[PDB]
Amino acid sequence: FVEMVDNLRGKSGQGYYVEMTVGSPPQTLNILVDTGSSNFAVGAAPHPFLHRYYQRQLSSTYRDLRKGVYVPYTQGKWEGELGTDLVSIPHGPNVTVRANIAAITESDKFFINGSNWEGILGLAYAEIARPDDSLEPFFDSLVKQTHVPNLFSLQLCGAVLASVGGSMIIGGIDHSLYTGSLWYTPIRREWYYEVIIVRVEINGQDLKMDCKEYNYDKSIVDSGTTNLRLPKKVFEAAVKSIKAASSTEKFPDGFWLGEQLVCWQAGTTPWNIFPVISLYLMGEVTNQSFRITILPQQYLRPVEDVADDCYKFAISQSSTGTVMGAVIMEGFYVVFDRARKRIGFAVSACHVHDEFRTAAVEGPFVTLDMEDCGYN
Ligand SMILES: C[C@@]1(c2cccc(NC(=O)c3ccc(Cl)cn3)c2)COCC(N)=N1
Ligand SMILES: [Cl-]
């Protein structure tokens, strides 16, 4: 799968996007890769902050589905008109598919002011598709209409704003993108890419919480979220343990909550004074787990737009459960193995790390009562 390697691009804090083509003749658009949603939604109107947009009138193969959608979020929101059209991926498999498309006609706090993408490729399952599960997601259509195997994998690499890159391998796994072995965790339910975190460790030390807390109300793997988001009780326990672990220098209480930055002298970044973070995921076999481990390079993010100088704490509290965002996924090569209801983790060949430590995917470990860690 050499032709799909390095097919993702982006800027720091603005997500990873892939080039796609929509309509006949083909209109080129840059589309955010999003494992935490399920709509293929593109800007269909001349928003002043978008570079490009989908012009339905120019497409001979566009079919109107005569149905609106209104999708609000915690802050942002979009509205659009449903349809279908012929979609392709230039740096993907040599195929063309009839996919559902939400033509976004109005939005607020959805598009990023001066990013280089014009839509979202929701890669999750139909259950969370707006307006309902009858709207077939893009990847479900691709698999049905072609011989592309029912899996994809993401290598998100990370860094005025720094220019990031990566790979979305569609229909397979590229072994040059990871070191060591892939370790697999079951997809608990096919809606989001839901998983079960069974144990958390900060600097080798267990938080010793009831493992329902770790997955309350769920844990997901989400390429469309920056932070490692943790449930409130888990976040407090984690921050307290990170604080005790990093007692070289002291910071204000606003830094841990993401209410302010922290800054050092230029080119004197203290990585060594912060701990590694380990999440134990449920394994393939009864009573078996494995642990993925991230470095401070993943969760202390350099912020480039100040007016490496300054940094932000990219672990935050959530009321929507755990979200294993870019902070997690920049450490690992992630295989979304839909055909076998599982998600693979391996150490990524492009993850940022120092001379002393690296990210890791280690196992197997014996953990009891792992199914009790799920929330219902
Ligand atoms: C649909 C939705 C969504 C809407 C609009 C934008 C974005 N995502 C980004 O802007 C972004 C930024 C940085 C990085 Cl590393 C990744 N993604 C996500 C809702 O919110 C969470 C989610 N999973 N998907
Ligand atoms: Cl028209």
Does the residue 5 lie in any domain? Answer: no
CA dihedral 204, 207, 210, 214 (to 10 degrees): -80
Whether residue 120 is found in the same domain as residue 261: no
Structure determination technique employed? X-ray
List the residue whose alpha carbon is closest to atom 4 of ligand 1. Answer: 110
Q: Which two tokens stand for residue 154?
A: 């993401």
Residue type, 359: A
Residues 129 and 61 in one domain: yes
Pocket test for ligand 1, best of 32, 110, 138 (most atoms within 8 A of CB): 32
Q: Whose CA is nearest to atom 14 of ligand 1?
A: 15
Kindly name the residue from 85, 140, 222, 337 that is annotated as catalytic: 222
Place of tokens 């996924």: 329
CA 74 distance to own-chain centroid: 18
Alpha helices by DSSP H, listed for the chain, are 138-145, 232-245, 253-256, 296-299, 326-329
222 and 360 share a domain? yes
The residue whose two tokens read 């001349």 is 46
| Helix, strand counts (H, E) of the chain | 5, 26
Within this chain, do residues 188 and 269 fall inside the same structural domain, yes or no? yes
Residue 218 and residue 355 in one domain: yes
Pocket flag, ligand 1, residue 158 (CB < 6 Å):
no
Tell how far the Cα of 113 is from the centroid of ligand 2, in angstroms. 28
Domain that holds residue 92: 16-148
Resolution in units of Å: 2.6
Active site residue 34: yes
The answer to whether the CB of 10 is under 6 A from ligand 1 is no
- Same domain? 220 vs 318: yes
Catalytic (active site) residue 206: no
Ligand positioned closest to the Cα atom of 85:
2
Domain stops at, among 119, 148, 177 = 148
Residue 6 lies in a domain: no
Q: Give how many domains the chain has, as a whole number.
A: 2
Residues 130 and 250 occupy one common structural domain: no
318 lines ligand 1 (CB under 6 A): no
Q: Are residues 163 and 279 in the same domain?
A: yes
Which of 104, 125, 148 is the C-terminal boundary of a domain?
148
Nearest by Cα to 46 from 98, 109, 153, 118? 118
Query: Is 38's C-beta closer than 6 angstroms to any atom of ligand 1?
Result: no
Q: Which of 128, 148, 168 is the last residue of a domain?
A: 148
Exposed / middle / buried, residue 253 (Cβ in 10 Å: 0-12, 13-18, 19+): exposed
Residue 31 lies in a domain: yes
Ligand nearest to the CA of 54: 2
The answer to the question of residue 186 being in a domain is yes
- Pocket of ligand 1 contains residue 110 by CB under 6 Å: yes
CA of 225 to the centre of ligand 1 (A): 5
Distance 57 CA to ligand 2 centre (A): 4
Residues 164 and 250 in one domain: yes
* Strand bridging mode 119-122 / 315-318: unpaired
The CATH number of the domain holding residue 98 is 2.40.70.10
Cα(84) to centroid of ligand 2, in Å? 13
Q: Give yes or no: residues 218 and 340 share one domain.
A: yes
199 and 262 housed in the same domain:
yes
For the sheet containing 262-263, what is the strand order? 262-263, 310-313, 300-302
Residue 243 lies in a domain: yes
Residue 9 lies in a domain: no
Query: Same domain for 237 and 253?
Result: yes
